Design a protein around this ligand. Structure first.
Ligand SMILES: Nc1nc(N)c2cc(CNc3cc(Cl)ccc3Cl)cnc2n1
Length: 186
């Protein structure tokens, strides 16, 4: 299995959701970036795995589920089988990553991308090991009801650039944003 990664877009007051939708109007190129980063696999004959909580799964418009070209795994203790359109179900993050070593996944998965929501991000971020965060900073405040966990900069180093990742300020629908990549290894 390849690298372990979180990807997120967050507003200036750390918001990632309001009522199961984006705090901000849709940003088409920002989404294109999320799709390209999560879908692109370095390794022939493998796909990337996306891991998400139940609420994150149901927040994706039906037409985009499952995320195409990616293996889709949902996390839930309540659900007893993968939701309609999803591929895998695990009770927890540690379980999902364990499954990634089983015969049925071991040779199929390249990168793993955690795509939300708050508790799954939080658990990943303080679990020892090599982890990157791909963070889009939406540089305004947006009313939100779910939030990104604190990034501990003592552990997470902001990379000065990354191949495939624009370094400069982006702007869509009047809203400035920028892409960042953080890395820890502990
Ligand atoms: N950088 C970044 N990282 C993520 N994890 C993202 C996740 C999504 C989720 N997809 C989606 C979700 C809702 Cl709530 C409404 C409509 C759509 Cl198309 C969209 N953009 C993302 N950008």
């Amino acid at each position: 299995v390849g690298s372990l990664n979180c990807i997120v877009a967050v507003s200036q007051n750390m918001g990632i959701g309001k009522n199961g939708d984006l705090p901000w109007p849709p940003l088409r190129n920002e989404f294109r970036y999320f799709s390209r980063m999560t879908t692109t696999s370095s390794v022939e004959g493998k796909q990337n795995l996306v891991i998400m909580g139940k609420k994150t799964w149901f927040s994706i418009p039906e037409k985009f589920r499952p995320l195409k070209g990616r293996i889709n795994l949902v996390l839930s203790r309540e659900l007893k089988e993968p939701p309609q359109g999803a591929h895998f179900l695990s009770r927890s993050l540690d379980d999902a990553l364990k499954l990634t070593e089983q015969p049925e996944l071991a040779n199929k998965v390249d990168m793993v991308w955690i795509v939300g929501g708050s508790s799954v991000y939080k658990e990943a971020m303080n679990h020892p090991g090599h982890l990157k965060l791909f963070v889009t900073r939406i540089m305004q405040d947006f009313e939100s009801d779910t939030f990104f966990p604190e990034i501990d900069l003592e552990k997470y180093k902001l990379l000065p650039e990354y191949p495939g990742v624009l370094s400069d300020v982006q702007e869509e629908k009047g809203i400035k944003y920028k892409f960042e990549v953080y890395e820890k290894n502990d």
